[PDB]
A paper describes a structure:
The red/far-red light receptor phytochrome B (phyB) plays essential roles in regulating various plant development processes. PhyB covalently binds the linear tetrapyrrole PΦB as a chromophore. In these structures, two parallel phyB-Pfr molecules interact with one PIF6 molecule.
We tested the interactions between PIF6β and phyBNY276H, red light-irradiated phyBN, or the HKRD region. Pull-down and SEC results revealed that phyBNY276H and red light-irradiated phyBN interact with PIF6β, but the HKRD region cannot interact with PIF6β, confirming that phyBN is sufficient for PIF6β binding. Only the PSMs of each phyBNY276H protomer and the N-terminal region of PIF6β (PIF6N) are clearly modeled, but the PAS1 and PAS2 domains could not be modeled due to the absence of density maps. The PΦB molecules adopt a “Z” configuration in both structures.
Author numbering:
A (entry chain B): 11 to 32, 42 to 61
B (entry chain C): 111 to 144, 156 to 380, 393 to 565, 577 to 621
C (entry chain A): 54 to 143, 157 to 379, 392 to 565, 576 to 621
The structure:
């Protein structure tokens, strides 16, 4: 499952250096949905 | 004058004067003309910037570095993707309509074709690095997610050049094909040759009517459309697809280092209905194929080295066992001559005494084989064969399906070492005339009817090493 | 713990010293600060917290693009860079962002905003409402909303933008193909090819490959430069010249770019209701710290581009970096940066393959040598392992070897004299007669009184016990023997090199685990053989 990268942050907790953080369709279906040009006809 | 698939268009133009020399019959309808004719300047069919880009591509040395070009039709103003390549007469241009007309979305998709490939390859980087099956399964799932086809498979080729299906992902309601073996004649040699030079093949609709390609009557021979991406499929394969139930297809090559590169296999995609995917996703897949090839080559080298280490360790243990006891002790303890190579059984003949292990012939049968070997193979140090029938063993080569292949190593003149393999069909399992996968599977089990798997060079070298050590030991005795 | 975790305190202390020197109006003292600040000791947690916040929540960006932070549900602006108005041709807290761009661009931005777990419009190509200037918009998510980085794009026909992207990706593919055809088993050739390919692709003045060692310090192993520049190939520098936090960040943003180190940073204004300063970890426009900017200025490099080299070690490991330098300001477009990322992934895969093959070959060689030595021992006296062609000098990498057996001393190569070795034996028995052997990187650090007498010839020692009075010794000299670069208060590469040759002054190269395992195996074999006699 492809996904977007998530970014983390270093923090100092309890003497430790810790890193903290902040789909049912295929990629083709998303490409068809998001690259629809109908709105450009208005 | 060949044929092309109707989903695109093709124009062949002279390199020096830009004058059209050939074209598909559907060119005028697609370009919006219906002028296009012999001797016409191609640049007059496109806008000014399109002509500038075309000239730039034409004057380049590595023409494959300017592909795909984005151009616009002079009459209607629609966008096309153009792919150019060189032939003996001039330059062939494959024109394909673009389904996105907004420039902003065009640029966005061109960037996504890179971002998607990077995000997919990051998932191959994360594998442990010691398993080929896991690598193949991951690639199958990634390609299926990217393209969305109904079936995605990995095909591996053997030394015999026959094919096997090693990984597959599909719908729940389709019949599986994992484990299928088929002859080597189902994919002619021309197709394998082309899969190296042009690493993708796409068929949008096998039932679609092909389109004739007209060319200048002044040419002494028909144009070479072999490298064109719109070339129409053959009758044999088109009928095969129709019988199997596949309307659309996409095949990609797997390349490794040979000894010069080698075609290891293919990735094959099938859809129950017509399908044509947009360019960004095609290139996202084409980029992932290269990383897959790199990792596969790494895995092969590592497996080879580990196998060598294993064989050396086993040989050392066997030599120690020989030193501790008489030669018979080689075939009594848990390590034995059966672990040196992959086999179904083994046997040791020592001063007329017989020591069988696993699936091996009988003592009378062994005496018959020794008689035959001395009659026809006395002048040798040993041999190997994957079928006693082909070798010509008269004395009832029909030892059964259990004993088909034999490798023999001589010790002095009467002591012998034997390794035995049964017939190939023992190791092949699949759940499942008219050209169909079942017909191919049945035709495969007619060339391996009484044949075993071939003896590898590495296994022969291991057997030779053990033979040399044993011969030295018996020289001392 | 190890140095990876011990280095955080040292980095924080060096940062504090640099800040204090800046405040007092004095120059920064490099060598003195390194000598005073040493691994160990302790530090208040507040210093670590402040250091980390300063690094990750700086509040400044580079002045070659804009940054706008917006709320996810309302599309209302919660933060922006001070240069946003000038670049957009125009903002306020609460303004709706969709009004800053054309209507079609706002629709595309909404689509990009409403996606879940992946989006195929990132980056987006947008235009400004007032002027119609094209921008690449790059979006990422932070704990309070969405940050949009706006990078100006060249004004031209879209066909030419597509052509540029295509050309970059095709060059990357050709470079990977060239990597495919190399004959294996040679890492140096791999690096030499990659450096040239990257220089051809990007066009910077200098391209270098940096490798990190087990001790965390760095080495320059390949280089491709303009003729009139000095070479840095062969240089070693301490582990504190690249802090650990930047190394951690390199595992997320695999490409870092600095366009001009002399440019004035731009402050980021944010809504006063936010508790903390805005996180800039994922942003590409983050500005470098003063330490590194001054280092770059002293060196003479104005533009920089760094790409991480990551190998598999399930979990991933950072092997090194590819570093590019330019003598003037330089910026490259987004497609080329993604092409560079693609090529770095290919390079990492090949590198990992090569490392594993080398490990296997070494194991094979060690096993063969051990077998030959045992065969030699059985057919000869105990002294048949130091007098023949293969010897204990081949089991591991060393400068000298020695065998002490029944009062006889057999040296090979650079080894102590028969008088000094007696003293070493007395020291070992008095202090270390409670084990089967040991290994030390520096006799002086261990506490051997005669370490100075041995000098630079003998610094590191591995000893294996056979019986109460028979021993095997392997000896290594000091590191500076094998290090050659053809080239004190100012931050500069020469200061780094001089500071490196101050911690390895009386040390040899460390003993690896494979070498110790080989030594222990041969030790057990010889122990059994001699016990049987
Ligand atoms: C008829 C002459 C023989 C033959 C010829 C033929 N085959 C190809 C190309 C392919 N045929 C493939 C074979 C299979 N496809 C499958 O999925 C399975 C089993 C499940 C088989 C056996 C495949 C795959 C290829 C390559 C991919 C591709 O699409 O090219 C060709 C070339 C056709 C073309 O593309 O021009 C030809 C002439 N195929 C047969 O099965 C019979 C014995
Ligand atoms: C001052 C606090 C200490 C320090 C800090 C520091 N260093 C970096 C990043 C880098 N420094 C690099 C080191 C070198 N560059 C070279 O070419 C050579 C030798 C020839 C050295 C020693 C390099 C490279 C990096 C990483 C590349 C990059 O561009 O990031 C940073 C972070 C920089 C940033 O981007 O924020 C910091 C804070 N450097 C010192 O010299 C002292 C000990």
């Amino acid at each position: 499952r492809l996904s977007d990268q998530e970014y983390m942050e270093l923090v100092f907790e309890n003497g430790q250096i810790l890193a903290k953080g902040q789909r049912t369709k295929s990629i083709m279906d998303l490409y068809e949905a998001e690259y629809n040009e109908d709105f450009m006809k208005s | 004058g060949g044929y092309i698939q109707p989903f695109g268009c093709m124009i062949a133009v002279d390199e020096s004067s830009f004058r059209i020399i050939g074209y598909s019959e559907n060119a005028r309808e697609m370009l919006g003309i219906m002028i296009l004719a012999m001797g016409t300047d191609v640049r007059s069919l496109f806008t000014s910037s399109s002509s500038i880009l075309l000239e730039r591509a034409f004057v380049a040395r590595e023409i494959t570095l300017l592909n795909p070009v984005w151009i616009h039709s002079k009459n209607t103003g629609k966008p096309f993707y153009a792919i150019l390549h060189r032939i003996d007469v001039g330059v062939v241009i494959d024109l394909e309509p673009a389904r996105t007309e907004d420039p902003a979305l065009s640029i966005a998709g061109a960037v996504q074709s890179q971002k998607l490939a990077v995000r997919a390859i990051s998932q191959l980087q994360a594998l442990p690095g010691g398993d080929i099956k896991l690598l193949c399964d991951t690639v199958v799932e990634s390609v299926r997610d990217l393209t969305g086809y109904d079936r995605v498979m990995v095909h591996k080729f053997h030394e015999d050049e026959h094919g096997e299906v090693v990984a597959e992902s599909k719908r729940d309601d389709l019949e599986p094909y994992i484990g299928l073996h088929y002859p080597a004649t189902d994919i002619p040699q021309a197709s394998r040759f082309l899969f190296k030079q042009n690493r993708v093949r796409m068929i949008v609709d096998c039932n679609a009517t092909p389109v004739l390609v007209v060319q200048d009557d002044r040419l002494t021979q028909s144009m070479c459309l072999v490298g064109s991406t719109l070339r129409a499929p053959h009758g044999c394969h088109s009928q095969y697809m129709a019988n199997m139930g596949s309307i659309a297809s996409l095949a990609m090559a797997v390349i490794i280092n040979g000894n010069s590169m080698r075609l290891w296999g293919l990735v094959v995609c099938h859809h129950t209905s017509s399908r044509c995917i947009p360019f960004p996703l095609r290139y996202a897949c084409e980029f992932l194929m290269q990383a897959f090839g790199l990792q596969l080559n790494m895995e092969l080298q590592l497996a080879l080295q580990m196998s060598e280490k294993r064989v050396l360790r086993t040989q050392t243990l066997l030599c120690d066992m020989l030193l501790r006891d008489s030669p018979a002790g080689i075939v009594t303890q848990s390590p034995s001559i059966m672990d040196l190579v992959k086999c179904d059984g083994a046997a040791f003949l020592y001063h007329g005494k017989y020591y069988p292990l696993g699936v091996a012939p009988s003592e009378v049968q062994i005496k018959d084989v020794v008689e035959w070997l001395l009659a026809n193979h006395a002048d040798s140090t040993g041999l190997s064969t994957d079928s006693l029938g082909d070798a010509g063993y008269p004395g009832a080569a029909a030892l059964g399906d259990a004993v088909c292949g034999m490798a023999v190593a001589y010790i002095t003149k009467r002591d012998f070492l034997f390794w035995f393999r049964s017939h190939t069909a023992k190791e092949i399992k699949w759940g499942g005339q008219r050209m169909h996968p079942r017909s191919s599977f049945q035709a495969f089990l007619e060339v391996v009817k009484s044949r075993s798997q071939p003896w590898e060079t590495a296994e022969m070298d291991a057997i030779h090493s053990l033979q040399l050590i044993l011969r030295d030991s018996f020289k001392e005795s």
